Enzyme design. Sequence first.
Site, short mmCIF file in Angstrom:
data_model
loop_
_atom_site.label_atom_id
_atom_site.label_comp_id
_atom_site.label_asym_id
_atom_site.label_seq_id
_atom_site.Cartn_x
_atom_site.Cartn_y
_atom_site.Cartn_z
N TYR A 97 19.35 6.48 1.86
CA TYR A 97 17.91 6.39 2.04
C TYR A 97 17.29 5.77 0.79
O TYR A 97 17.94 4.98 0.10
CB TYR A 97 17.34 7.75 2.45
CG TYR A 97 16.00 7.64 3.12
CD1 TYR A 97 15.86 6.89 4.28
CD2 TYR A 97 14.88 8.25 2.59
CE1 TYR A 97 14.64 6.75 4.90
CE2 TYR A 97 13.64 8.13 3.21
CZ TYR A 97 13.52 7.37 4.37
OH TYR A 97 12.31 7.22 4.99
N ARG A 150 5.00 -1.45 7.89
CA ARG A 150 4.75 -1.03 6.52
C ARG A 150 5.92 -0.20 6.00
O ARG A 150 5.84 1.03 5.94
CB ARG A 150 3.44 -0.25 6.46
CG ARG A 150 2.98 0.03 5.05
CD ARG A 150 1.95 1.13 5.09
NE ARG A 150 1.33 1.12 3.78
CZ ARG A 150 0.55 0.14 3.33
NH1 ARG A 150 0.27 -0.91 4.09
NH2 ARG A 150 0.04 0.23 2.11
N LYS A 168 16.63 7.60 7.72
CA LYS A 168 15.85 8.83 7.80
C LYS A 168 16.58 9.90 8.60
O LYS A 168 16.63 11.07 8.22
CB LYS A 168 14.51 8.58 8.49
CG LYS A 168 13.51 9.73 8.44
CD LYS A 168 12.55 9.58 7.31
CE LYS A 168 11.41 10.58 7.35
NZ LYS A 168 10.47 10.21 6.27
N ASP A 241 6.29 4.48 8.86
CA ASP A 241 6.18 3.14 8.33
C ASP A 241 5.43 2.23 9.31
O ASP A 241 5.73 1.05 9.40
CB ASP A 241 7.54 2.58 7.90
CG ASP A 241 8.08 3.17 6.60
OD1 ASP A 241 7.47 4.13 6.11
OD2 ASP A 241 9.10 2.68 6.08
N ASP A 263 5.42 11.27 9.12
CA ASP A 263 5.92 11.75 7.85
C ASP A 263 5.21 11.10 6.67
O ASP A 263 5.09 11.72 5.60
CB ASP A 263 7.44 11.65 7.73
CG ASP A 263 7.92 12.48 6.55
OD1 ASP A 263 7.72 13.69 6.59
OD2 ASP A 263 8.41 11.88 5.57
N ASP A 264 4.72 9.87 6.86
CA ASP A 264 4.06 9.16 5.77
C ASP A 264 2.73 9.83 5.45
O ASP A 264 2.26 9.72 4.32
CB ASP A 264 3.80 7.68 6.13
CG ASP A 264 5.11 6.95 6.33
OD1 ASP A 264 5.86 6.79 5.33
OD2 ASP A 264 5.41 6.65 7.50
N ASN A 403 5.71 4.73 -6.46
CA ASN A 403 7.14 4.45 -6.37
C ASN A 403 7.41 2.94 -6.34
O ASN A 403 6.64 2.20 -5.71
CB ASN A 403 7.76 5.09 -5.11
CG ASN A 403 7.61 6.60 -5.05
OD1 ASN A 403 7.97 7.32 -6.00
ND2 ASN A 403 7.10 7.11 -3.95
N1 NDP Z 1 6.33 11.57 -1.65
C1 NDP Z 1 5.97 10.47 -2.43
O1 NDP Z 1 6.43 10.21 -3.54
C2 NDP Z 1 4.97 9.55 -1.84
C3 NDP Z 1 4.41 8.59 -2.65
N2 NDP Z 1 3.52 7.74 -2.14
C4 NDP Z 1 3.00 6.72 -3.03
O2 NDP Z 1 1.61 6.57 -2.97
C5 NDP Z 1 1.24 5.19 -3.14
C6 NDP Z 1 0.24 4.76 -2.07
O3 NDP Z 1 0.75 5.08 -0.76
P1 NDP Z 1 -0.19 5.12 0.57
O4 NDP Z 1 -1.36 6.06 0.44
O5 NDP Z 1 0.73 5.33 1.77
O6 NDP Z 1 -0.77 3.60 0.52
P2 NDP Z 1 -2.12 3.06 1.25
O7 NDP Z 1 -1.86 1.60 1.21
O8 NDP Z 1 -2.43 3.78 2.52
O9 NDP Z 1 -3.25 3.48 0.15
C7 NDP Z 1 -3.33 2.77 -1.09
C8 NDP Z 1 -4.65 3.16 -1.72
O10 NDP Z 1 -4.72 2.61 -3.04
C9 NDP Z 1 -6.02 2.05 -3.19
N3 NDP Z 1 -6.08 1.22 -4.38
C10 NDP Z 1 -5.52 -0.02 -4.55
N4 NDP Z 1 -5.73 -0.50 -5.76
C11 NDP Z 1 -6.43 0.45 -6.42
C12 NDP Z 1 -6.93 0.52 -7.71
N5 NDP Z 1 -6.76 -0.50 -8.63
N6 NDP Z 1 -7.59 1.62 -8.08
C13 NDP Z 1 -7.76 2.60 -7.19
N7 NDP Z 1 -7.33 2.64 -5.92
C14 NDP Z 1 -6.66 1.53 -5.59
C15 NDP Z 1 -6.24 1.39 -1.86
O11 NDP Z 1 -7.65 1.12 -1.89
P3 NDP Z 1 -8.46 0.66 -0.57
O12 NDP Z 1 -8.74 1.86 0.31
O13 NDP Z 1 -9.69 0.09 -1.27
O14 NDP Z 1 -7.54 -0.39 0.01
C16 NDP Z 1 -5.81 2.52 -0.95
O15 NDP Z 1 -6.82 3.53 -0.86
C17 NDP Z 1 2.55 4.40 -3.09
O16 NDP Z 1 2.94 4.08 -4.41
C18 NDP Z 1 3.57 5.40 -2.56
O17 NDP Z 1 4.85 5.19 -3.16
C19 NDP Z 1 3.16 7.76 -0.85
C20 NDP Z 1 3.70 8.70 0.00
C21 NDP Z 1 4.62 9.60 -0.50
MN MN Z 2 7.79 5.90 4.94
#
Ligand code: NDP
Ligand code: MN
Lengths: 564, 564, 564
Positions: A97, A150, A168, A241, A263-264, A403
Amino acid sequence: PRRRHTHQRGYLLTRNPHLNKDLAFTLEERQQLNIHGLLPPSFNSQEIQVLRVVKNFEHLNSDFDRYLLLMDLQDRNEKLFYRVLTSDIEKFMPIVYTPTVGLACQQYSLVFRKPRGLFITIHDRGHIASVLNAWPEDVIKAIVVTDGERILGLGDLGCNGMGIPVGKLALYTACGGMNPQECLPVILDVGTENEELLKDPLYIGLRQRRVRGSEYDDFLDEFMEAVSSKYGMNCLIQFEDFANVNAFRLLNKYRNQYCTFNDDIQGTASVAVAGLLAALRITKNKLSDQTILFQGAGEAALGIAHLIVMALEKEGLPKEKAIKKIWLVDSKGLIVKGRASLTQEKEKFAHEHEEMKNLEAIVQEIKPTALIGVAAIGGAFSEQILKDMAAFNERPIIFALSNPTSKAECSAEQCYKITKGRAIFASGSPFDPVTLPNGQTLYPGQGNNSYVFPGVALGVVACGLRQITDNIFLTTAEVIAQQVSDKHLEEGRLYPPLNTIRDVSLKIAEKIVKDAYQEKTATVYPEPQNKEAFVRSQMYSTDYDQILPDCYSWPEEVQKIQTK
Amino acid sequence: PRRRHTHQRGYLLTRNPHLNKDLAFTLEERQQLNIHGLLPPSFNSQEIQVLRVVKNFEHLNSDFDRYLLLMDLQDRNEKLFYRVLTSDIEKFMPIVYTPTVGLACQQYSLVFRKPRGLFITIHDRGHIASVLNAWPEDVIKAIVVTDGERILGLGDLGCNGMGIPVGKLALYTACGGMNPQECLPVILDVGTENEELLKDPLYIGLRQRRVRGSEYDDFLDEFMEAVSSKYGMNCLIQFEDFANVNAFRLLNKYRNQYCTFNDDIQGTASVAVAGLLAALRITKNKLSDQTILFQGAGEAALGIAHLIVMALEKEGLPKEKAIKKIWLVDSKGLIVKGRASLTQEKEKFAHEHEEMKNLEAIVQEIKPTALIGVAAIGGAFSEQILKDMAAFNERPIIFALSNPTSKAECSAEQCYKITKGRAIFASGSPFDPVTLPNGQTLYPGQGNNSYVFPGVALGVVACGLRQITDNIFLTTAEVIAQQVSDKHLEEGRLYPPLNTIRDVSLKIAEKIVKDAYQEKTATVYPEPQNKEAFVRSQMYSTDYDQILPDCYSWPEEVQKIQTK
Amino acid sequence: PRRRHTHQRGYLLTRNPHLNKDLAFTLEERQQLNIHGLLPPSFNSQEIQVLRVVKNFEHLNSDFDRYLLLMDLQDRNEKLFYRVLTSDIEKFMPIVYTPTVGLACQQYSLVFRKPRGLFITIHDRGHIASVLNAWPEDVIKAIVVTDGERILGLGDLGCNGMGIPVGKLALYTACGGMNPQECLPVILDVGTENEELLKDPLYIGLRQRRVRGSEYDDFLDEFMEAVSSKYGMNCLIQFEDFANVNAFRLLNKYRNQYCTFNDDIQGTASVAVAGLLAALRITKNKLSDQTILFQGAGEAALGIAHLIVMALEKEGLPKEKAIKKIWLVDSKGLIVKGRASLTQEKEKFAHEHEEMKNLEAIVQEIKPTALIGVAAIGGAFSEQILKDMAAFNERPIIFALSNPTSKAECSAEQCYKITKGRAIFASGSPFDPVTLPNGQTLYPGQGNNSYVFPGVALGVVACGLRQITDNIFLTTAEVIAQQVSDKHLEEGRLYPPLNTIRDVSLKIAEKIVKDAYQEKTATVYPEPQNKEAFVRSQMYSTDYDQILPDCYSWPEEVQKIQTK
Ligand SMILES: NC(=O)C1=CN([C@@H]2O[C@H](COP(=O)(O)OP(=O)(O)OC[C@H]3O[C@@H](n4cnc5c(N)ncnc54)[C@H](OP(=O)(O)O)[C@@H]3O)[C@@H](O)[C@H]2O)C=CC1
Ligand SMILES: [Mn+2]
Ligand SMILES: NC(=O)C1=CN([C@@H]2O[C@H](COP(=O)(O)OP(=O)(O)OC[C@H]3O[C@@H](n4cnc5c(N)ncnc54)[C@H](OP(=O)(O)O)[C@@H]3O)[C@@H](O)[C@H]2O)C=CC1
Ligand SMILES: NC(=O)C1=CN([C@@H]2O[C@H](COP(=O)(O)OP(=O)(O)OC[C@H]3O[C@@H](n4cnc5c(N)ncnc54)[C@H](OP(=O)(O)O)[C@@H]3O)[C@@H](O)[C@H]2O)C=CC1
Ligand SMILES: CCCc1nc2c(C)ccn(Cc3ccc4nc(-c5ccccc5-c5nnn[nH]5)sc4c3)c-2n1
Ligand SMILES: CCCc1nc2c(C)ccn(Cc3ccc4nc(-c5ccccc5-c5nnn[nH]5)sc4c3)c-2n1
Ligand SMILES: CCCc1nc2c(C)ccn(Cc3ccc4nc(-c5ccccc5-c5nnn[nH]5)sc4c3)c-2n1
Ligand SMILES: [Mn+2]
Ligand SMILES: [Mn+2]
């Protein structure tokens, strides 16, 4: 050992990865199965088979080569595959994974060898039922489905996203003891927006753009009816995704009629909240004492925020007060009432306040007790941010969940250094132990979605839950936090050690099942006396089943050939 | 396109490498065969599949890893595998056969994944018939069998020897158009003397010393009976990589009653003679005119000398004249009347003469026209030898047959330099082109056994020859030399280009067949009109077969569903 | 016993009449075959099985019902079916074949239950190869084919004629020990001229008139090609119950290229000549002494006459003189030179003589020593004719070969009465023994085709004869005649007993096989030492095969599961 008396015989039995034992087949088994001679003349224990695989594994030079080897194993001998995976779950998880499965999806069309899973495309609209008919296992209890729009942090990989459901469900089995034979990985291919792949002569997917709108919607509708129709309404359907806009939308659409979760969104929420709950045992205060700031306001942030609000409501705090304890930042800045470019979901957290663009100043102004990075902006938790968090808080909670390491909001090293060792820290990606000047070594853990999904699925399927409430995820977060010892906390871990994941999953399943029987949400009857032993009984073992015919005599008088 | 109306459907069809096309299955094929959805939604031509395999092949880092990729391919999609091989036979042959298959055999027990071929052990004594029952193809026409005692130049590798029959049969198909579905690779495991394997926990073979004497003889006896009884007297049985003593004994034992040959003995004699015959067109004289000195007096030497004598006889020389034209040197020196440590077979060439040990002196004394190295002593054709050969002869014939090049009697560079460009040269193992000071480039060929066995098998099988006489091997030599063009000879090449081997194999078989009908030794009737077309029609194509049911309508009057 | 190791298991095994033993499966067989529970829990020997079947058979009210019972048996347990048949061949032969099979064919469309045999229609033209692919047995050695245009004496029954090939092949097995799994009954449906079937709503064949001409001829050509190409040129192809012109025409057309014969022509010739030959041991004189008169000059008369001429030429008489010994009478009367309505085949016996149309006067004129009835005119051998035959002959040879009883030229009773017991008599259909006025009983036998075809097929296939000369039929007649004891001849029997038929078939085949090695026409090599034991070894037994896997241990040391 489990008995499963197969009617298969000869060469074709060896080609079924649920029947095939390779050299573990005894002489008696080979002759009885009519395969004596198709295998060299030595008889291996499972331990001997594991030794062979590991020796090969160690001779390999990349994580990718390691992934290809194990996938070849999965497709030859399922039990040996899981014996290997579970012999060192911490080693093998990151190979089958994330993060490696990422590279596998990028390279899926190039390295495509033996297929795994079911491909359903938009051009099979109206015919999904007969696509299902091609799958050789009739009894299915868990599906993971993606449309590849995604994949991880890699974007649209279209049909190449099949690596995700496959890997998964590997963890569903390895971590949670789901029977792989009852697991079905699906990709829905509606096209891709990925330009390289549209150009790539080797691409295995539909060489067209994504079908959108109500035709997409009706295809997803049919997918849901067909699957639940064929496999029953108790069949778990886990989305993964999808694009941002589809993920929440589809969860909302289906969650009340189907046994489904995402799960996301929901797994991410659970594990994040689990880490918070554990951290509270260090801060020694209530959730209602916290001020939460999210950098990010996407699927992660909004899922996490929704579940925090629910935990706060559980603690007694009314909803509209709970919400006030959570601030969001997106790409346009802090989310406040009357800002431009808000969505309806962002708007729930749009409190009255001056607009702010800059995170360092947002931190200084909001003064959170807990700062959660989920924006994928590496380095966002700068020295000033960390300095400020340590100024405002005795033990600042800081979650750098982005990540991989390269995207992480800060390292463990930077966090502990700048906060002079007082920060309570967790991250999305692994960081090495950090030893502070005072001579303590801290072991910051990872909020891995793998703590959550395997046990949730096991739980849900085991008692036949028909819907998966957000309460299952809150309850799960509590269970996970419960498995962290005081010693762990003083070590700086907010999560149980990775190597115990099989135990975590069991406790998560146990709690779900107890609760379902308690509140009459279970569908599997009669109700078991012993919920522990009931769940264990539903877990897949890595030991080979016996597959030979049941042989036994009758008394002489009635067993003998009659003549005169 | 060829037919093949299979009854197989669904998942198990895709597990049969004879049915499975992977992505080349059309949508209609997939739906019809109940596999639609088990594959990603793209339809690939055979060439597009080839490009995918070759891109993979290229990024690998060793010939061994390349071997593993192709062997995996063999066991998933048999046609594609053969299409890959034949797309560049000169590039792929060294990967699936010598020398890479040599490392494969050494490593077989470590890298063992899915089995290929039939394993028959001493302990199946009395049961060989039932061991044969496990093989899923009923119609077998060619068997390659080994006891692993003498693999290439690597000695006794016991059950690991199985790599050899598998690779050998792949060349039967790729080079000579034998149907792989009708080919059976076999290992007889009677134990091994290989001390490393006996110690090795991973060893796949019987962990015991080799059984010898009558016990072994009875076992082989039963092998021959079982196989010919089941597959019929027309089924070809080719021994390979037996210990030299056994190889000769067993060929002598069976050749007159079974359709059997030994490629290490007979194929080697054939291809060496082929080179000699080709060389006669540069020297522009008769085989009659030569004096041949053999460096070595073992399996290769004695086999080649036997066939030379037969060619000499055929020219019109009586045996006893023929014989005096050939001198041999063994580890003890020149073979001469009444010398010590001589065998019955070396005796045939023990002419009256002073004993000699030093090869330079032997060379100065015998003054051969042709020097053939088959001793496995690198560097034995020294500077002085080469100098003398080129002083005694206008165009000295020099074959350095010992393998690999590191054991070769001399290099091509040294041969050409010291003979001042006058030597006619061939080797066992490939050497680079050499360019003379006069700006001409010579391209010394290899006496590859692959020129002989594919064509011989194709021939023997196509016409139902019950026995394989030595004359088949003389004929085959003549055919090979005949394929060498005057242009090639001027380029220093004694063998047809390796990329034409399909054609060479066809011509060999054409000749065997034409002969067999002429002297009434064929058993396939009626006699074919056109013998080229007939052989052509027996050859396996790399084109996919059609396997869909034959669909065609009847007139509507008799197709109508009757009612009343 | 004999071993056949099947990979079939579970329910479907029981649906295969070659694998299915019903209650004769032992407990261990059932458990091992995954069928334990599908049968009631008693274990029957074959003899108990036979007792059940026979009990049912004797409770039924008609031969037709008996046919349906045994046919139901054939389609569920092949071995038991043939055990039943062979337990009393004289009793069961007339149930599964003539005359009962005639009623079966008339009724075939009404009583059609489970199919037997392969149906190939004119509309399958161009696709015959693909039709063959539906047959579940790849190894085919004997075919019986009809177009149903001349079934018995019941004319054109179209597709309803399938009963003939099925029943005929049962006799191949029961009588001659041909392997039924190796036999293929075929009907060619090119339409029917039968108006009642054409009108019948239930008719199972092509509701159309017969395709004639070159379309027909081209269809039959493809059939011979497809069948010989798929099953080999050694596959026996026996024509049955084609229209008269077709039968001879087709036999002449193919007999030289294909392993083919026509039983209606050649089988009939053989058995009638065997009878003649037997009778010469009563009249104690030479065949060249006979004057033979045929009532009839159709398929039967001309084939018998041709073989008589051959036997006369073998005794030493030129053809032109042998011919003079035979007189045919057709529906236009005595065959003579110049006569109107003569086909060129009747022309062969058109001697110089005046026309005659009255049989009684033809007799008194010809004064034959042998009188052969093959005209289908019931009662044509009138008291007057019989009185003359006894007046002109000490022991008149009288054959009433027409079928069934009601069409016989005379009955046994009448023949013995009017010739006052001195007639040498045989018939086509069976008559009861006849007790003369002196109180002695004579036992006229039947010139049944069953004496000939089973042994011919056994012999031809056993030694691999590629064509079937008429000499086979002459040799066969001789063999059958030699099986009659002197004691039998004294009882008035011209034929060996029906209950010894397998022995007669063995003897017929032995001779064919001896002759074929003797004159190098056999193609099965090497030549067996003992032709008797070789043919025996090729004969299907009614004993059950063992089908359990061959289980046997290895020494404990090598059989041991290996650990560390
Ligand atoms: N268990 C874990 O470790 C998990 C970790 N994650 C991590 O979280 C991160 C985001 O995932 P996810 O929520 O699914 O992604 P999304 O694409 O759904 O959300 C990304 C968010 O970041 C915002 N953003 C982008 N640039 C900036 C900035 N410069 N300042 C502030 N906000 C900003 C986007 O803004 P806008 O709304 O304006 O587009 C959006 O709200 C990834 O790195 C992922 O690896 C996610 C799930 C699980
Ligand atoms: Mn995922
Ligand atoms: N197509 C090709 O290119 C082929 C090439 N070969 C090559 O030929 C070589 C021989 O193989 P094979 O005949 O099967 O092997 P054997 O072991 O049967 O024969 C080896 C011979 O070399 C002799 N010998 C050893 N040392 C010396 C020495 N110092 N001087 C002279 N003779 C010596 C041995 O003598 P003694 O009998 O006294 O032990 C023996 O006669 C190998 O290198 C093999 O690679 C073989 C087959 C095919
Ligand atoms: N082993 C056995 O018991 C066998 C017995 N038979 C019996 O032989 C009989 C004939 O069979 P087969 O030869 O196949 O039939 P065909 O229809 O080929 O021959 C019938 C012959 O009888 C002739 N005929 C018709 N009426 C008379 C008449 N009034 N006087 C003289 N001849 C006449 C026809 O003459 P024309 O040429 O003028 O039409 C024709 O030559 C059948 O009853 C059949 O059962 C047949 C085969 C085997
Ligand atoms: C276990 C807790 C899970 C949970 N249950 C919930 C219920 C019942 C209600 C609301 N949420 C929050 C939530 C969760 C995830 C999420 N992704 C979104 C999104 C993300 C990116 C882009 C657009 C959108 C977008 N914007 N509008 N539509 N899609 S918005 C959004 C809201 C919930 N979370
Ligand atoms: C295409 C023609 C091939 C051919 N047909 C032949 C016939 C009919 C007869 C003889 N030879 C020569 C021949 C061929 C091979 C061979 N290996 C041997 C051997 C090799 C190594 C060690 C001991 C022995 C050993 N020493 N004594 N016994 N075994 S001896 C030997 C003789 C023939 N070669
Ligand atoms: C064991 C002896 C087999 C045998 N070999 C033979 C050879 C080589 C040559 C001739 N006969 C005689 C023979 C045998 C059968 C037969 N049915 C016929 C026929 C019958 C009725 C109607 C038309 C025809 C018809 N008329 N013309 N064509 N069809 S004519 C005819 C001639 C042979 N019999
Ligand atoms: Mn070899
Ligand atoms: Mn008939």
